[PDB]
Design an enzyme around this catalytic site. Structure first.
Site, PDB file in Angstrom:
ATOM      1  N   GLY A  78       0.801  -1.208   0.000  1.00 46.54           N
ATOM      2  CA  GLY A  78       0.000   0.000   0.000  1.00 46.54           C
ATOM      3  C   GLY A  78       0.837   1.261   0.000  1.00 46.54           C
ATOM      4  O   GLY A  78       1.918   1.296   0.595  1.00 46.54           O
ATOM      5  N   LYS A  79       0.350   2.306  -0.666  1.00 46.14           N
ATOM      6  CA  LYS A  79       1.063   3.573  -0.730  1.00 46.14           C
ATOM      7  C   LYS A  79       0.057   4.711  -0.802  1.00 46.14           C
ATOM      8  O   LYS A  79      -0.993   4.583  -1.437  1.00 46.14           O
ATOM      9  CB  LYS A  79       2.011   3.624  -1.935  1.00 46.14           C
ATOM     10  N   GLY A  87       2.100   7.398   3.597  1.00 41.20           N
ATOM     11  CA  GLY A  87       3.380   6.735   3.464  1.00 41.20           C
ATOM     12  C   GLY A  87       3.260   5.412   2.737  1.00 41.20           C
ATOM     13  O   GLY A  87       2.627   5.336   1.679  1.00 41.20           O
ATOM     14  N   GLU A  88       3.860   4.361   3.291  1.00 36.13           N
ATOM     15  CA  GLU A  88       3.855   3.047   2.666  1.00 36.13           C
ATOM     16  C   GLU A  88       3.590   1.982   3.718  1.00 36.13           C
ATOM     17  O   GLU A  88       3.960   2.132   4.885  1.00 36.13           O
ATOM     18  CB  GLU A  88       5.186   2.743   1.960  1.00 36.13           C
ATOM     19  N   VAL A  89       2.943   0.900   3.291  1.00 35.76           N
ATOM     20  CA  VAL A  89       2.762  -0.294   4.106  1.00 35.76           C
ATOM     21  C   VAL A  89       3.468  -1.445   3.405  1.00 35.76           C
ATOM     22  O   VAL A  89       3.257  -1.672   2.208  1.00 35.76           O
ATOM     23  CB  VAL A  89       1.276  -0.620   4.336  1.00 35.76           C
ATOM     24  N   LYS A 142       4.456  -0.102   8.556  1.00 34.51           N
ATOM     25  CA  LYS A 142       4.021   1.175   8.003  1.00 34.51           C
ATOM     26  C   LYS A 142       5.132   2.196   8.215  1.00 34.51           C
ATOM     27  O   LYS A 142       5.439   2.562   9.354  1.00 34.51           O
ATOM     28  CB  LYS A 142       2.720   1.646   8.649  1.00 34.51           C
ATOM     29  N   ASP A 156     -11.639   8.172  11.580  1.00 34.19           N
ATOM     30  CA  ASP A 156     -11.332   7.898  10.179  1.00 34.19           C
ATOM     31  C   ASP A 156     -11.754   6.478   9.822  1.00 34.19           C
ATOM     32  O   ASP A 156     -11.061   5.773   9.080  1.00 34.19           O
ATOM     33  CB  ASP A 156      -9.847   8.115   9.872  1.00 34.19           C
TER      34      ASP A 156
HETATM   35  C1  LIG Z   1       1.538  -1.671   9.789  1.00 33.75           C
HETATM   36  O1  LIG Z   1       0.614  -0.613   9.650  1.00 33.75           O
HETATM   37  C2  LIG Z   1      -0.596  -0.879   8.985  1.00 33.75           C
HETATM   38  C3  LIG Z   1      -0.702  -2.119   8.284  1.00 33.75           C
HETATM   39  C4  LIG Z   1      -1.895  -2.472   7.587  1.00 33.75           C
HETATM   40  C5  LIG Z   1      -2.005  -3.801   6.819  1.00 33.75           C
HETATM   41  C6  LIG Z   1      -1.910  -5.020   7.513  1.00 33.75           C
HETATM   42  N1  LIG Z   1      -2.001  -6.257   6.963  1.00 33.75           N
HETATM   43  C7  LIG Z   1      -2.200  -6.357   5.609  1.00 33.75           C
HETATM   44  C8  LIG Z   1      -2.317  -5.222   4.766  1.00 33.75           C
HETATM   45  C9  LIG Z   1      -2.232  -3.970   5.388  1.00 33.75           C
HETATM   46  C10 LIG Z   1      -2.337  -2.730   4.530  1.00 33.75           C
HETATM   47  C11 LIG Z   1      -3.465  -2.616   3.444  1.00 33.75           C
HETATM   48  O2  LIG Z   1      -4.165  -3.793   2.972  1.00 33.75           O
HETATM   49  C12 LIG Z   1      -3.401  -4.866   2.472  1.00 33.75           C
HETATM   50  C13 LIG Z   1      -3.602  -5.189   1.070  1.00 33.75           C
HETATM   51  C14 LIG Z   1      -2.895  -6.258   0.435  1.00 33.75           C
HETATM   52  N2  LIG Z   1      -3.055  -6.640  -0.997  1.00 33.75           N
HETATM   53  C15 LIG Z   1      -4.379  -6.437  -1.723  1.00 33.75           C
HETATM   54  C16 LIG Z   1      -4.462  -5.187  -2.663  1.00 33.75           C
HETATM   55  N3  LIG Z   1      -3.267  -4.942  -3.467  1.00 33.75           N
HETATM   56  C17 LIG Z   1      -2.406  -6.126  -3.460  1.00 33.75           C
HETATM   57  C18 LIG Z   1      -1.958  -6.524  -2.030  1.00 33.75           C
HETATM   58  C19 LIG Z   1      -2.010  -6.951   1.300  1.00 33.75           C
HETATM   59  C20 LIG Z   1      -1.853  -6.593   2.669  1.00 33.75           C
HETATM   60  C21 LIG Z   1      -2.549  -5.541   3.304  1.00 33.75           C
HETATM   61  C22 LIG Z   1      -2.919  -1.503   7.651  1.00 33.75           C
HETATM   62  C23 LIG Z   1      -2.807  -0.268   8.345  1.00 33.75           C
HETATM   63  O3  LIG Z   1      -3.904   0.598   8.329  1.00 33.75           O
HETATM   64  C24 LIG Z   1      -4.674   0.682   7.143  1.00 33.75           C
HETATM   65  C25 LIG Z   1      -1.626   0.035   9.019  1.00 33.75           C
HETATM   66  O4  LIG Z   1      -1.501   1.262   9.721  1.00 33.75           O
HETATM   67  C26 LIG Z   1      -2.182   1.385  10.941  1.00 33.75           C
END
Ligand SMILES: COc1cc(-c2cncc3c2CCOc2cc(N4CCNCC4)ccc2-3)cc(OC)c1OC
Ligand SMILES: [N+]
Length: 295
Positions: free
Chosen positions: A12-13, A17-19, A32, A133
């Site tokens: 995620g971006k 920022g970025e995850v 994150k 949010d």
């Molecule tokens: C570490 O901080 C965070 C992590 C995550 C998070 C945790 N675990 C899995 C994912 C995420 C981020 C967004 O969703 C995801 C999406 C995907 N995939 C599907 C769409 N594109 C291809 C990859 C994979 C993993 C995650 C969330 C946060 O808050 C929105 C965070 O901050 C509070």
């Protein structure tokens, strides 16, 4: 510690920022890396996770906070549990839900929100917390079918004994698509903690609408759509939502087929009780959790 984490892929971006999906002691973690414009969100989340010790099965599992200096700059890291199923916004577009799957999602979100809103008493007890949010992209789906709320960067706290309110110091604004009418009209009393809980219930009813559409009833199901998809464009402006939510007094449409399923009827009545223009008329997070439990 940020030194032991192997950044494997960016999932995620955005402006935040970025995850990243990282490895840490042979296990997948979510990292994150905050943007320089969103530093206050890292401080608030670190406070909620480390100082307040926010912990709940329906809230994203905290692991560690860290700071790493590289390239003459210092990045602010938040490391949490990794959910390979992604956000609820991602999950609802890949599968349909049955009655149990739908109720497990919506009850888990409600119980996690109620935990935030309800103050735990005693010394070092958790104060009442408002998310501010809440949205499907800030909700993650676990493999057990349950969900967990994420992003505590805009959190606001309050304690009943001292009657003190902690709004923090964040220039970040909430997601406009999920903004309550009192926020768009700028009538929300910023000095009252109840105001921040009522904007969560409003946004909760919108996620409720997103999930209910994906529940199959009598071989009928709705395609996934973000709230107000048919009236606002992508990245709607403040005036876009104010025209729909405040001026036209519009709400998401209840599909007629929902009245043919008893679970969707009680769900449609639930979100309607979250969308009152009068914030004090909306239901509490505890009442939503109770109503969802009896279903
Ligand atoms: C570490 O901080 C965070 C992590 C995550 C998070 C945790 N675990 C899995 C994912 C995420 C981020 C967004 O969703 C995801 C999406 C995907 N995939 C599907 C769409 N594109 C291809 C990859 C994979 C993993 C995650 C969330 C946060 O808050 C929105 C965070 O901050 C509070
Ligand atoms: N996402």
């Amino acid at each position: 510690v940020a030194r032991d984490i192997t950044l494997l892929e960016c999932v995620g971006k955005g402006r935040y920022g970025e995850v990243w999906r990282g490895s840490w002691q042979g296990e997948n973690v979510a990292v994150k890396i905050f943007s320089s414009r969103d530093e206050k969100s890292w401080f608030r989340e670190t406070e909620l996770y480390n100082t307040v010790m926010l912990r709940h099965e329906n809230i994203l599992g905290f692991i560690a906070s860290d700071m790493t200096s590289r390239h003459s700059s210092t990045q602010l890291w938040l490391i949490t549990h990794y959910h390979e199923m992604g956000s609820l916004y991602d999950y609802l577009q890949l599968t349909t839900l049955d009655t149990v799957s739908c109720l497990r999602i919506v009850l888990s979100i409600a119980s996690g929100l109620a935990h935030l809103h309800i103050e735990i008493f005693g010394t070092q007890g958790k104060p009442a917390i408002a998310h501010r949010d809440l949205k499907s992209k800030n909700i993650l789906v676990k493999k057990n079918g349950q969900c967990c709320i994420a992003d505590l960067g805009l959190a606001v706290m309050h304690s009943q004994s001292t009657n003190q309110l902690d709004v923090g110091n964040n220039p970040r604004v909430g997601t406009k698509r999920y903004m309550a009418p009192e926020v768009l009209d700028e009538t929300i009393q910023v000095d009252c903690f109840d105001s921040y809980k009522r904007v969560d219930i409003w946004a909760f009813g919108l996620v409720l609408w997103e999930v209910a559409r994906r529940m199959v009833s009598n071989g009928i199901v709705e395609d996934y759509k973000p709230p107000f998809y048919d009236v606002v464009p992508n990245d709607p402006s403040f005036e876009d939502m104010r025209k729909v939510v405040c001026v036209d007094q519009q709400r998401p449409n209840i599909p007629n087929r929902w009245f043919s399923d008893p679970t969707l009827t009680s769900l449609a009545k639930l979100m309607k009780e979250c969308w009152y223009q009068n914030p004090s008329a909306r239901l509490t997070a505890l009442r939503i959790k109770k109503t969802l439990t009896k279903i």
